[PDB]
Amino acid sequence: MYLRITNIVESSFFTKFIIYLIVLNGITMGLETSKTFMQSFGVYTTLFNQIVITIFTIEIILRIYVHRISFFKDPWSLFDFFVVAISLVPTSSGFEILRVLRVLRLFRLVTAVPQMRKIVSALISVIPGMLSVIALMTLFFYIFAIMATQLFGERFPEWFGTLGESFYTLFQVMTLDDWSDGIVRPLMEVYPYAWVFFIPFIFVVTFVMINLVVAICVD
Amino acid sequence: MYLRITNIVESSFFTKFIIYLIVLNGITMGLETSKTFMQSFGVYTTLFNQIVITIFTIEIILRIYVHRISFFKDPWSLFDFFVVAISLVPTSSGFEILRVLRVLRLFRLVTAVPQMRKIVSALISVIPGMLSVIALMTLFFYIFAIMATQLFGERFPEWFGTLGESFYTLFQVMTLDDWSDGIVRPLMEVYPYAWVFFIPFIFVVTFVMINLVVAICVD
Amino acid sequence: MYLRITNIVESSFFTKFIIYLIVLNGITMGLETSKTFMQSFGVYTTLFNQIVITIFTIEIILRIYVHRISFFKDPWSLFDFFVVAISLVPTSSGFEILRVLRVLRLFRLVTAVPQMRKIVSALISVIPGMLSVIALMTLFFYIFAIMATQLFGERFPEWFGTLGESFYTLFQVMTLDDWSDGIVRPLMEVYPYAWVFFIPFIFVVTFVMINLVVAICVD
Amino acid sequence: MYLRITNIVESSFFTKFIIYLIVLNGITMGLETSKTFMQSFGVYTTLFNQIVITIFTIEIILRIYVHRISFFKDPWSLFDFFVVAISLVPTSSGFEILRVLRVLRLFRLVTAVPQMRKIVSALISVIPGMLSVIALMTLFFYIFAIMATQLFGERFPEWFGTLGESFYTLFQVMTLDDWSDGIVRPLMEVYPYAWVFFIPFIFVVTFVMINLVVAICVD
Ligand SMILES: [Ca+2]
Ligand SMILES: [Ca+2]
């Protein structure tokens, strides 16, 4: 039976039947958004949903026999597995983000269809080339996030009261979002020199971010 | 008469007479902006407008004889037809955006003058090579737009109440416009971890957009 | 005396003396900022300034005889002429921006030092190759600015009431500054579809500017 | 003993021990953030901290005997000295920013581990190629900062009242942060033409920065 089903699984139909299902469950998940719609056809799609999930667990079971060890060394397959595993955790108990993480299965459209995979892989491949940069930056963030907490957290604890808060704020200043009128001018009303912290912070971080872009243009 | 008019239409004079009309109607539409101006010369320019609109239909009628099917397979020609047709729809009934879209005819200065034609085409040509990225992105948006609506739409409906609102709001976060002080800091006031949803969204979406720019710096 | 002064003017010393003056009057203009300082040395500086202006006119007088027609065909020389001319208009009569445009003379530091001339010229040279783009864009702005004035100026005249206002507002949307929370969300409170006008505006204008940057990173 | 210690200092184990301490002290510093933690194990940390600082002076003492003049001509070594020196200044008292500046020692993780060194150096090298451009920009800023102070500082002293303030504000406009709704629309409420000052400022400054980015991609 091994070769029987290995012929079912690798068939253009089977794979095209799944891709057909992704687009249906995605269309169906957009419909689950409407508080009105759910009032009419809520049960249609609750069942239809549990239905697709079985189909999806069946496939992943089928796909493993056919691939064995090869399946758990393929990123895309591991993925498909975890995105379905998530989709199996009961509609109850624990945390309920897991209910919302069920929508992550529409990322199977990225998996099941190549080209997307071409492009996604294309994107991801640039990440190893960025890790030296990313690492640098994280040290830098880490250091300043610390200074800022102990420089501004007493008067300004929403923004800097905690190490994590400073991180967040720093992220915001880095994305250059409301940084002056929102954060640094306020800070200066108490600490006239805070500009001395934040203007330099902006330079290094914009410079770094620029360099990283010119580097992704090194290919 | 075919060859008569094919030599009328294809003449430098014809084209340059139209181009003379574009820059005149365009000047005249800037003039229709002023509530003052309209109180003196509103009559001049409403009639002048109907005049230019005839001239433009006459031209388009003529241009079709000279080209036949060749005309309805030219992008630039179709346009002028569509934009003139828009400018034909009466000044009453239906919606009023059709009145306002009349100003779209000034895009004939792009259509009826080369180099512009070159440049626009140069731009558009880059699009097909973005279509894999653009597509990737639209899935991602679609996914998160769904997640957000069911995570925040109860307490924060203006921003996330409806799928369409989540899209808009997400766009705004992507353009990085008031994302922290406007949306995410507020959101965290009720859902402390919302930072866990939006910072990641920011990285990917910003990354993706970076790749797309380096890609355009490939062709 | 012609060859006498052509040897005075073309001297390293002549130029280095002027350059010495630029840095001093610039230093002195940074000093004229203090309401305090003017109260202790206002006259020292008012006279020093009137002094340097002569020194610069004497130079321009000399420089012209030494160059004749060659002078009014050198950009840089014309500049220094017009910049110094501005600096000649009296303190009392006319517009008072003219008093402020005097500080434009510090741009002579750009004019009198060749290494700067290199870079400034480097910058400017890219502009001709953007004129095809810059034009495209100006047409676009012109058309939309017209559309917006007639779509929003009745309920929202501050942002859109006048042809020029829309330009300003559109610019702000384009620099992507508070476009959503500042303008488009408000606008949607009356005209639900304004999102239909402004998102597409953002795409084109963002796209175009990407192309223009990729184009410069081509030349 | 010279060769004794030269074989101690240059040892892989020596290098590994210090890098061990950096990751420990940086971890140590993150914990120093919690007002909770400090009440519990504050003592543990302040002594371990003084301990590490001893170790670090000893290392630099040893390292100099082993390099003599060679040390104070190495950028990275100077840094380590100047950073540890900062950490040497007692817990009192004049400026307490000196206490905060202690955390700068975590940049030794940048210093003691190569590849980081590789990358940082890569970043720094681009600076010389921007200095004509950075200079250009600084003169430009300097000139406008003066004009703005004298054009708006009477009515808008918070933003423009002082040379330094104009600098801050201009920087804010340049980073393109809240520039319209925060500054220029206001300004215009009193001085209708301020748009004539800031739009042009924005073009140049945006252009130059773009040029500087393309200039970087050149190297
Ligand atoms: Ca902003
Ligand atoms: Ca803002």
PDB file of all heavy atoms in Angstrom, chain A residues 176-178, chain B residues 176-178, chain C residues 176-178, chain D residues 176-178, ligand 1:
ATOM      1  N   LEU A 176      11.267  56.263  14.084  1.00  0.00           N
ATOM      2  CA  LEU A 176      11.120  57.720  14.048  1.00  0.00           C
ATOM      3  C   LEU A 176       9.660  58.235  14.235  1.00  0.00           C
ATOM      4  O   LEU A 176       9.346  59.308  13.731  1.00  0.00           O
ATOM      5  CB  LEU A 176      11.803  58.341  12.821  1.00  0.00           C
ATOM      6  CG  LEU A 176      13.351  58.277  12.850  1.00  0.00           C
ATOM      7  CD1 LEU A 176      14.042  59.076  11.688  1.00  0.00           C
ATOM      8  CD2 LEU A 176      13.969  58.666  14.185  1.00  0.00           C
ATOM      9  N   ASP A 177       8.815  57.475  14.979  1.00  0.00           N
ATOM     10  CA  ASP A 177       7.331  57.725  15.217  1.00  0.00           C
ATOM     11  C   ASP A 177       6.972  58.633  16.462  1.00  0.00           C
ATOM     12  O   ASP A 177       7.037  58.208  17.641  1.00  0.00           O
ATOM     13  CB  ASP A 177       6.594  56.392  15.404  1.00  0.00           C
ATOM     14  CG  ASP A 177       5.136  56.564  15.817  1.00  0.00           C
ATOM     15  OD1 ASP A 177       4.477  57.446  15.225  1.00  0.00           O
ATOM     16  OD2 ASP A 177       4.684  55.845  16.760  1.00  0.00           O
ATOM     17  N   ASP A 178       6.555  59.865  16.157  1.00  0.00           N
ATOM     18  CA  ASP A 178       6.203  60.829  17.143  1.00  0.00           C
ATOM     19  C   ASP A 178       7.323  61.048  18.145  1.00  0.00           C
ATOM     20  O   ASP A 178       7.044  61.430  19.273  1.00  0.00           O
ATOM     21  CB  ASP A 178       4.895  60.468  17.848  1.00  0.00           C
ATOM     22  CG  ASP A 178       4.294  61.692  18.569  1.00  0.00           C
ATOM     23  OD1 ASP A 178       4.705  62.834  18.190  1.00  0.00           O
ATOM     24  OD2 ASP A 178       3.384  61.533  19.424  1.00  0.00           O
TER      25      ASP A 178
ATOM     26  N   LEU B 176       4.004  53.437   8.868  1.00  0.00           N
ATOM     27  CA  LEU B 176       4.570  53.765  10.178  1.00  0.00           C
ATOM     28  C   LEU B 176       4.004  55.083  10.767  1.00  0.00           C
ATOM     29  O   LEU B 176       4.702  55.751  11.519  1.00  0.00           O
ATOM     30  CB  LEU B 176       6.099  53.721  10.225  1.00  0.00           C
ATOM     31  CG  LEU B 176       6.709  52.306  10.072  1.00  0.00           C
ATOM     32  CD1 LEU B 176       8.239  52.347  10.110  1.00  0.00           C
ATOM     33  CD2 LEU B 176       6.217  51.251  11.052  1.00  0.00           C
ATOM     34  N   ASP B 177       2.753  55.438  10.400  1.00  0.00           N
ATOM     35  CA  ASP B 177       2.074  56.735  10.761  1.00  0.00           C
ATOM     36  C   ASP B 177       1.290  56.685  12.118  1.00  0.00           C
ATOM     37  O   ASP B 177       0.184  56.106  12.248  1.00  0.00           O
ATOM     38  CB  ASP B 177       1.105  57.152   9.667  1.00  0.00           C
ATOM     39  CG  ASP B 177       0.226  58.294  10.072  1.00  0.00           C
ATOM     40  OD1 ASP B 177       0.812  59.260  10.620  1.00  0.00           O
ATOM     41  OD2 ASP B 177      -1.023  58.217   9.847  1.00  0.00           O
ATOM     42  N   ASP B 178       1.885  57.369  13.093  1.00  0.00           N
ATOM     43  CA  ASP B 178       1.368  57.495  14.415  1.00  0.00           C
ATOM     44  C   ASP B 178       1.075  56.129  15.010  1.00  0.00           C
ATOM     45  O   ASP B 178       0.182  56.009  15.832  1.00  0.00           O
ATOM     46  CB  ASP B 178       0.132  58.373  14.423  1.00  0.00           C
ATOM     47  CG  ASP B 178      -0.187  58.829  15.821  1.00  0.00           C
ATOM     48  OD1 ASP B 178       0.778  58.692  16.646  1.00  0.00           O
ATOM     49  OD2 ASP B 178      -1.328  59.320  16.070  1.00  0.00           O
TER      50      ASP B 178
ATOM     51  N   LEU C 176       4.251  61.478   4.104  1.00  0.00           N
ATOM     52  CA  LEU C 176       3.557  60.534   4.978  1.00  0.00           C
ATOM     53  C   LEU C 176       3.419  61.009   6.456  1.00  0.00           C
ATOM     54  O   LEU C 176       3.410  60.177   7.362  1.00  0.00           O
ATOM     55  CB  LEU C 176       4.166  59.131   4.886  1.00  0.00           C
ATOM     56  CG  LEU C 176       3.988  58.310   3.593  1.00  0.00           C
ATOM     57  CD1 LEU C 176       4.767  56.993   3.769  1.00  0.00           C
ATOM     58  CD2 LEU C 176       2.546  58.037   3.113  1.00  0.00           C
ATOM     59  N   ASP C 177       3.351  62.338   6.674  1.00  0.00           N
ATOM     60  CA  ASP C 177       3.298  63.011   8.028  1.00  0.00           C
ATOM     61  C   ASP C 177       1.864  63.197   8.612  1.00  0.00           C
ATOM     62  O   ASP C 177       1.109  64.129   8.233  1.00  0.00           O
ATOM     63  CB  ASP C 177       3.932  64.410   7.953  1.00  0.00           C
ATOM     64  CG  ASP C 177       3.798  65.187   9.225  1.00  0.00           C
ATOM     65  OD1 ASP C 177       4.009  64.548  10.274  1.00  0.00           O
ATOM     66  OD2 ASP C 177       3.440  66.403   9.159  1.00  0.00           O
ATOM     67  N   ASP C 178       1.523  62.326   9.562  1.00  0.00           N
ATOM     68  CA  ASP C 178       0.238  62.384  10.203  1.00  0.00           C
ATOM     69  C   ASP C 178      -0.888  62.263   9.217  1.00  0.00           C
ATOM     70  O   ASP C 178      -1.961  62.790   9.474  1.00  0.00           O
ATOM     71  CB  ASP C 178       0.078  63.658  11.033  1.00  0.00           C
ATOM     72  CG  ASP C 178      -0.961  63.490  12.112  1.00  0.00           C
ATOM     73  OD1 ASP C 178      -1.285  62.304  12.421  1.00  0.00           O
ATOM     74  OD2 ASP C 178      -1.375  64.518  12.685  1.00  0.00           O
TER      75      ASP C 178
ATOM     76  N   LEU D 176      11.490  64.266   9.451  1.00  0.00           N
ATOM     77  CA  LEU D 176      10.124  64.433   8.950  1.00  0.00           C
ATOM     78  C   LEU D 176       9.007  64.103  10.005  1.00  0.00           C
ATOM     79  O   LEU D 176       7.892  63.753   9.627  1.00  0.00           O
ATOM     80  CB  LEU D 176       9.917  63.696   7.621  1.00  0.00           C
ATOM     81  CG  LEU D 176      10.579  64.282   6.352  1.00  0.00           C
ATOM     82  CD1 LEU D 176      10.087  63.526   5.096  1.00  0.00           C
ATOM     83  CD2 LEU D 176      10.403  65.787   6.118  1.00  0.00           C
ATOM     84  N   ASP D 177       9.316  64.305  11.304  1.00  0.00           N
ATOM     85  CA  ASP D 177       8.450  63.990  12.489  1.00  0.00           C
ATOM     86  C   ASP D 177       7.475  65.137  12.964  1.00  0.00           C
ATOM     87  O   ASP D 177       7.868  66.143  13.611  1.00  0.00           O
ATOM     88  CB  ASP D 177       9.359  63.642  13.668  1.00  0.00           C
ATOM     89  CG  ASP D 177       8.624  63.463  14.975  1.00  0.00           C
ATOM     90  OD1 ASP D 177       7.512  62.896  14.925  1.00  0.00           O
ATOM     91  OD2 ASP D 177       9.144  63.951  16.023  1.00  0.00           O
ATOM     92  N   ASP D 178       6.193  64.913  12.685  1.00  0.00           N
ATOM     93  CA  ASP D 178       5.132  65.806  13.044  1.00  0.00           C
ATOM     94  C   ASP D 178       5.353  67.199  12.482  1.00  0.00           C
ATOM     95  O   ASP D 178       4.892  68.165  13.056  1.00  0.00           O
ATOM     96  CB  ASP D 178       4.963  65.843  14.576  1.00  0.00           C
ATOM     97  CG  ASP D 178       3.607  66.408  14.984  1.00  0.00           C
ATOM     98  OD1 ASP D 178       2.724  66.486  14.080  1.00  0.00           O
ATOM     99  OD2 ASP D 178       3.415  66.716  16.179  1.00  0.00           O
TER     100      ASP D 178
HETATM  101 CA    CA E   1       5.352  60.389  11.685  1.00  0.00          CA
END
